[PDB]
Design a protein around this ligand. Sequence first.
Ligand code: UD1
Length: 700
Amino acid sequence: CPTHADSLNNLANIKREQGNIEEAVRLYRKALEVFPEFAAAHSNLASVLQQQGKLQEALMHYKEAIRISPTFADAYSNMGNTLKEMQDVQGALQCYTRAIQINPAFADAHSNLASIHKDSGNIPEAIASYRTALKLKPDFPDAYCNLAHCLQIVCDWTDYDERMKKLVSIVADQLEKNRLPSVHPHHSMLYPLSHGFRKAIAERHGNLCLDKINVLHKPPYEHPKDLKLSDGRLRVGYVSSDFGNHPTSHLMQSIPGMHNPDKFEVFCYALSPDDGTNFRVKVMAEANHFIDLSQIPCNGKAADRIHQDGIHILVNMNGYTKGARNELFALRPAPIQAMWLGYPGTSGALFMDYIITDQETSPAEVAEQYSEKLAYMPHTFFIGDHANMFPHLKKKAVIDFKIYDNRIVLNGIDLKAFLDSLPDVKIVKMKCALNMPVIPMNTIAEAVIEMINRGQIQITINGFSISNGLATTQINNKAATGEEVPRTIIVTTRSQYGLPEDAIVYCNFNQLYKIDPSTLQMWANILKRVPNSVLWLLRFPAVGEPNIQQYAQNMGLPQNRIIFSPVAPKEEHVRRGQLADVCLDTPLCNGHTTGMDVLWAGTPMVTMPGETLASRVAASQLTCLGCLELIAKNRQEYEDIAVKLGTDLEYLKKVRGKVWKQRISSPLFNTKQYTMELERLYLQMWEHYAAGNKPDHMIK
Ligand SMILES: CC(=O)N[C@H]1[C@@H](OP(=O)(O)OP(=O)(O)OC[C@H]2O[C@@H](n3ccc(=O)[nH]c3=O)[C@H](O)[C@@H]2O)O[C@H](CO)[C@@H](O)[C@@H]1O
C-alpha cells in the first residue's frame, strides 16, 4: 500500500532519468521528512549523493538504509561502491561479501567483488567472480565488458571474434539508449569499436565530471588576458598524479627544468603524495613552483589554488588514467587547457581545448576522432628522458668467443677508461666517428663469463668494478630504478635470460594485453620464415604466458620459439634490450614508453600504424628517428620488413647502426629541443586566445 513518501520516491526517480539530479535529491529528502524509516529513500538518495561526490553523506544514508532493511543486499553493494570510492577498499570488500552472503543470487555484488580483485591485480579471481556474476545475470554489460578486459590482460582469446562482436554491440546499444557505456575510455583502443564510438565513450565519462562539479555551484573563473601579473611570462601548469616513480615521469622529468625562465613560469601540480623517489625530487627542485594537490582533496579548493596562481595554460597529463582528477579541468581554472603525453586518446570533453600530438600520430584526416583541436608538435609529441636517465647506455662494448653486438655487452661511465687497461682491445668501426670495442676471449674475458655463469654479484678487473646485470638492485637500488646513474660497469649477456647465443632475437617488452590473435599470428608467420629466430616476451603478467604459448602451439610454433623473461627493474629492462636484434611492435596498441626504451638500446623497431592514437605512436617515434623503412602499411609489409632483418644480416647491421646513431642525432631523445618546440606551441595557443579567438587546430 502506497504512502505519501512512496509517491515522492516515484517522482524523484523520474527526475533522475530526466537528468535533473538536483531536484531528485530534494524530492528524496522530502520523502524522508514524511517517512524517516523509508529504506528505499535512504538507498536512493545515497545513490544520487554518490554521483554528486558527496560520499561521506551518501555513506551515512546507506547505513540507515541497511539498519531499516537488513536484507537490502542491493544497499550493501552500493555502500561498498561508495566506500571503494573513499579508498576504503577493506570496508568496501566487506560490503560485497556480506551482500553475497545474504543473497547468493545477487549478481551485482559478485561483479563488484571481481572489480576489487581486478584493481588489486588478482586477475584470475576477478575472472572467476565475473563469470559468476554473468551466470546469475546474463544480461550484465558491466560484468561482461570488465571480464572482457580481464581476459584481454592475460591473453585469454577464447571466442575472441565473437567477444569483440558483443563488446561493440553492447556499446552500440548503450549509446543508442543514451546510457553510460560499459567500456572504459582507456580500454576503447583495444576493441574494434567505431572511431565515433570511442569519442562518444570519452564524452560520457567527461560528463561524469560535470556532475561532480555542478554540486559545488562555482561561478566561472575569470581568466587572464595578458601576461602583466605574470611579468611577461607564460604560466604553464602541469597536472599529473605521476610525479614520482611512474612511466610518465620517466619521459618528461627533465622538461620542467629546461623551460625558459624569461618567457615561462612553470607550475607542477601533483595529484599524488611524495614517494621519496628522485623523480619527485628533480621536478620539485626544477619546476618554478611545485604544488602538492594531494593534500587538497576538495576539487573546489584545488581548482581555486590553480586559478590563484594565475595559470594561462593548464596541462592534463592524466586524462582517463589511474589517479586522474579531471574535475579540476571541468571547473576551468585556466583559459587554455590541453591534453599531453599521459593519456593516449581523446578526452571527449568540452573542458579540454587542445590535444598535443603530431602530424604522424594524429594526421589531419582523422581529427574527427578527437573532441579537442589538434596541436601538432614538429616531429613527435612523444619524449623520453633516456638521455638523462641512462647515459651509460650511450656507448657499449662486446666480448668475443670463437663479432656480434648483442651476445655479451658491457656498459659503463668509466668503460673507456677500463678498456685502456686491457691489452688486446679491437676497435670495430660502425658506419652511419663511432666505434664498438671488442674484447677477445682471454683470461680477463673468461673471468667475466665466470662471474655471469656462477651467478656472482660482481668482480674486480684491474681495479675496475665489473657488475652483473641481474644484480644491479643488490649493488645500487637507486641505480636500478633509474633514479641514479650506475657508477659501475654492467655486464649484459644473453645467457642471463635464456637466449640462444646465435639466434635472431625478436623482442617485445609490452604488457601482454597489447597482443591480440591477429598480432600473434602475424608474429608466428615471421618466426616460421626465420627458422633460427626466437620471440622474446615478458611475464607481464605471468599468468598470460601459458595462454600465449598455447596459441603459439596451435599456430604451429614449438615451445622453444617463444622465450619469456620476468619484468625487470627500470634500468635493467632498458639495458637488456641491447641483447635483442629486432623489436616487433604491437599494432593493436603500440609500445609507447617501451618503444622509447628499445630505441635507446639501439634496437630497430618494426611497427604498423593503425587508426587510433595509441596504434600510431611507434610510427611517429620512428619517423622522428629517421627510420621510415621500419614502418609497414599492412600486415604483409610488417612480416616482410621483420623477416628481412632476420635473414639479411648485412641489412640488419645497417639498420641497427642507423638506430644506434640516430637515437642521438635525431631530435627523438633531445629533451632540450623538445621543450623549446613545446614552448613554441604554447605561445601559438596563448596568442590565439589573446587575439580573442576560441581554440582551433595548430598545424605550425
Ligand atoms: C596504452 C597506454 O596507456 N600508454 C601510456 C603508457 O605507456 P606504455 O603503454 O608504453 O607503458 P606501460 O604503462 O605498459 O608501462 C611501461 C613502463 O614499464 C616499464 N617496464 C616494462 C617492462 C620491464 O620489464 N621493466 C620495466 O621497467 C618501462 O620501463 C616503462 O617505464 O604510459 C605512458 C606514460 O604515462 C603514456 O605516454 C602512454 O600513453
